[PDB]
Curated annotation (Swiss-Prot), chain A:
Biological role stated in the UniProt entry: Component of the origin recognition complex (ORC) that binds origins of replication. It has a role in both chromosomal replication and mating type transcriptional silencing. Binds to the ARS consensus sequence (ACS) of origins of replication.
The protein, known as: Origin recognition complex subunit 6
Organism of origin: Saccharomyces cerevisiae (strain ATCC 204508 / S288c) (Baker's yeast)
Family in the record: Belongs to the ORC6 family.
More about this protein: Present with 2970 molecules/cell in log phase SD medium.
From Swiss-Prot, chain B:
A single MF term (Gene Ontology): ATP binding
A Gene Ontology biological process term: pre-replicative complex assembly involved in nuclear cell cycle DNA replication
Keywords, alphabetical: ATP-binding, DNA replication, Nucleotide-binding, Nucleus
GO cellular-component term (any): Cul8-RING ubiquitin ligase complex
Self-association and partners: Component of the origin recognition complex (ORC) composed of at least ORC1, ORC2, ORC3, ORC4, ORC5 and ORC6. Interacts with ORC6. Component of a cullin-RING ligase (CRL)-like complex composed of at least the cullin RTT101, a linker protein MMS1, and the potential substrate receptor ORC5. Interacts with RTT101 and MMS1.
Its job: Component of the origin recognition complex (ORC) that binds origins of replication. It has a role in both chromosomal replication and mating type transcriptional silencing. Binds to the ARS consensus sequence (ACS) of origins of replication. This subunit is a candidate for the mediation of ATP-dependent binding of ORC to origins. May also be a substrate targeting component of a cullin-RING-based E3 ubiquitin-protein ligase complex RTT101(MMS1-ORC5).
Primary location: nucleus
Name the UniProt record assigns to this protein: Origin recognition complex subunit 5
Further information: Present with 768 molecules/cell in log phase SD medium.
Span of the entire protein shown here: 289 to 474 of 479
From Swiss-Prot, chain C:
Quaternary assembly: Component of the origin recognition complex (ORC) composed of at least ORC1, ORC2, ORC3, ORC4, ORC5 and ORC6. Interacts with MCM10 and TAH11.
Protein known as: Origin recognition complex subunit 2
Compartment(s) of residence: Nucleus
Family: Belongs to the ORC2 family.
Coiled coil: none
Part of the intact protein present: 242 to 498 of 620
Organism: Saccharomyces cerevisiae (strain ATCC 204508 / S288c) (Baker's yeast)
Phylogenetic lineage: Eukaryota, Fungi, Dikarya, Ascomycota, Saccharomycotina
Job description of the protein: Component of the origin recognition complex (ORC) that binds origins of replication. It has a role in both chromosomal replication and mating type transcriptional silencing. Binds to the ARS consensus sequence (ACS) of origins of replication.
Highest taxon in the source lineage: Eukaryota
Miscellaneous note of the record: Present with 1700 molecules/cell in log phase SD medium.
UniProtKB/Swiss-Prot annotation, chain D:
Its job: Acts as a component of the MCM2-7 complex (MCM complex) which is the putative replicative helicase essential for 'once per cell cycle' DNA replication initiation and elongation in eukaryotic cells. The active ATPase sites in the MCM2-7 ring are formed through the interaction surfaces of two neighboring subunits such that a critical structure of a conserved arginine finger motif is provided in trans relative to the ATP-binding site of the Walker A box of the adjacent subunit.
Included range, full protein: 773 to 864 of 868
Source superkingdom: Eukaryota
Protein name: DNA replication licensing factor MCM2
Disulfide bonds: none
Misc note: Present with 1690 molecules/cell in log phase SD medium. Early fractionation of eukaryotic MCM proteins yielded a variety of dimeric, trimeric and tetrameric complexes with unclear biological significance. Specifically a MCM467 subcomplex is shown to have in vitro helicase activity which is inhibited by the MCM2 subunit. The MCM2-7 hexamer is the proposed physiological active complex.
Source organism of this protein record: Saccharomyces cerevisiae (strain ATCC 204508 / S288c) (Baker's yeast)
């Protein structure tokens, strides 16, 4: 909910998907 | 010879316009010279003065002909056209666009709409 | 879509009559018990965006507020409780000029009189003189100009729009405005949009618009 | 002499185009795509193979078979719908 309102509101605090998430490295670390 | 072949009383790509503006001016001419009866069939009086229309028709036709939704650039181009006086309104003093009483009409001849259609590759010649 | 537009004897007296008191009863009782808590939570979340607006105002951008719902309290709170005190005490007395555009009798001469009196030691010529004056002046902000209903009846007129648009050229003036009409961006052409230099944000809040409807009676139906 | 036969290897080429053509029918246009169009595609596909005197249907014949039937269906639509469909079937 926070991300959607942040993006709709034009806030710069919303995470930008150029870097893959830390949760993705919770998966990629096992590789 | 060429002095005697042209009057040369003229004071001087004639219009260089944005693509959104060009398609808005195509749709406005369609609104101004197509009878309202055909809006439900074709899309789903040249010698006479242009008829009036509403912005609701213009936006729908523009959306139906552009190769856009409702971002501010469309309305900005429309207001630019009005300021350029390529489209006229039914008032002279204290312009109040947002008032519902105002109506819109085209202030551009066919010879320029044809060139705009050529420049945007549109086929107004087949709608009449 | 456009197809949704191309494909689209009773009387009002058949409904029960409404008195002026009854019209106010519902508007007063429901709005204090309906959606109060979720809108308060939304307001508390949205208040975190003030630093970004403050930074944009520092960098010379005007702010335009749009969305569903009344936009009085947000602008008033931002101008009074957050913006002016920071402008004053982080730089180390900022006039918070509030204009009610929904009033259909807001003479532009009167507002210009106040602006000239508060900024100056054929209105357009005086504004041009002010612009030429403040170019060499220090860049610190002096006046906050909150323009409610920049699409209001007193404001829709071309002359008043032209008067407002030149004010944003002066860096020492902060402009905040809100609009309600769907075709509000139609008001501004290339020159006016250029001089305004708005940064657009969606502040749709579902706040019950009551003050704007106060000036023009709804009891007509 | 020639009675060219189908290859089941081309089943995907036929079924996928049909489903794609059907999807655009409800999207734009009033003419609903019918099974008889698919029956027409196979017939003209067989005729194209019969032109080469080859006993089996090739992928090249199907491409030209798809082109003819789709083009006729698009060209029969009204002008407003006609331009939308030409862009949607630029591959075919």
């Amino acid at each position: 909910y926070d991300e959607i309102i942040f993006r709709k509101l034009g806030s710069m605090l919303q995470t930008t998907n150029i870097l893959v998430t830390d949760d993705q490295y919770n998966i990629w670390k096992k590789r | 010879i060429k002095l005697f072949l042209s009057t040369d009383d003229n004071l001087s790509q004639t219009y260089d316009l944005s693509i959104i503006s060009k398609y808005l001016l195509i749709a406005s001419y369609i609104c101004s010279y197509l009878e309202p009866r055909y809006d439900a069939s074709i899309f789903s009086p040249r010698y006479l003065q242009p008829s009036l229309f509403a912005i609701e028709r213009l936006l729908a036709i523009f959306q139906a002909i552009f190769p856009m939704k409702a971002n501010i650039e469309v309305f900005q181009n429309l207001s630019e056209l009005h300021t350029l006086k390529l489209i006229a309104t039914t008032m002279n003093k204290n312009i109040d666009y947002l008032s519902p009483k105002v109506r819109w009409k085209v202030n551009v001849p066919w010879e320029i709409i044809k060139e705009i259609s050529e420049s945007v590759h549109f086929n107004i010649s087949d709608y009449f | 879509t456009f197809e949704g537009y191309f494909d689209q004897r009773h009387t009002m007296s058949m409904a029960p009559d409404v008195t002026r008191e009854e019209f106010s009863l519902v508007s007063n009782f429901f709005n204090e018990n309906f959606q109060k808590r979720p809108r308060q939570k939304l307001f508390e979340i949205q208040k975190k965006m003030f630093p970004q607006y403050w930074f944009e105002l520092t960098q010379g951008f005007s702010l335009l507020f749009y969305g569903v719902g009344s936009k009085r309290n947000f602008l008033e709170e931002f101008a009074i409780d957050y913006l002016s005190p920071k402008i004053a005490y982080s730089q180390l007395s900022i006039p918070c000029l509030i204009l009610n555009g929904y009033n259909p009798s807001c003479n532009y001469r009167d507002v210009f009189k106040e602006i000239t009196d508060l900024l100056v030691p054929h209105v357009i010529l005086q504004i041009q003189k002010m612009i030429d004056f403040y170019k060499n002046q220090p860049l610190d902000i002096k006046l906050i100009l909150v323009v409610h209903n920049l699409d209001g009846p007193s404001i829709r007129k071309n002359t008043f729009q032209t008067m407002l648009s030149f004010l944003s050229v002066i860096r020492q003036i902060a402009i905040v405005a809100s609009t309600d009409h769907i075709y509000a961006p139609l008001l501004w052409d290339n020159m006016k949009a250029q001089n305004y230099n708005f940064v657009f944000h969606d502040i749709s809040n579902f706040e019950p618009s009551t003050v704007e409807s106060t000036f023009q009676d709804v009891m007509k139906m | 002499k020639i009675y060219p036969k189908l290859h089941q290897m081309d089943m995907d080429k036929v079924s996928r185009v049909y489903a794609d053509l059907r999807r655009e029918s409800i999207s734009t246009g009033s003419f609903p795509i019918t099974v008889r169009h698919l029956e027409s595609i196979l017939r003209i596909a067989e005729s194209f193979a019969k032109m080469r005197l080859s006993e089996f249907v090739s992928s090249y014949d199907l491409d030209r078979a798809i082109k003819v039937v789709v083009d006729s269906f698009v060209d029969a639509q009204k002008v407003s719908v006609r331009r939308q469909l030409r862009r949607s079937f630029a591959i075919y």
